């Protein structure tokens, strides 16, 4: 059950990742 | 202003990613 | 199938991500 | 077994990222 | 097989996408 | 098959964000 968990994690990290970019996003600009 | 609007595309597609990955766990755990 | 065309569009994102932060490094080296 | 090393890689790498990204909101404003 | 192969290879992008992550939120400090 | 061809666009991209990373890092030092 490894693989399924693993893409589990990777898909709640990767929408961590989206959030800090668009952070990011409007840091840059301001 | 141009990098600003490149990090806020990057973040667009970091988000399309994120609900790939998570349709793509659903699809494994079955 | 469909993860990975999502794989695949997310890989051009990065592309372009990157093609803008040398672009931004180029800036402040200017 | 090698994918699951990775997740957890990037998810201490997207962790750093976003506490570097909130402190640097702050530099600014 | 092919599809493991592919997931070893995957793993081992994220992985260098995990580094090269971390050095950009290094440079965003300093 | 067309997982393994993503993986690879995906491999790639990843290169060039990092060396993308390297030169904005060295921008910052001076």
Chains 1, 2, 3, 5, 6 share one sequence.
Request: aromatic content about 16%.
């Amino acid at each position: 059950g490894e693989f399924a968990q693993a893409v589990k994690e990777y898909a709640k990290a990767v929408k961590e990742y989206a959030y800090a970019v668009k952070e990011y996003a409007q840091a840059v600009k301001g």
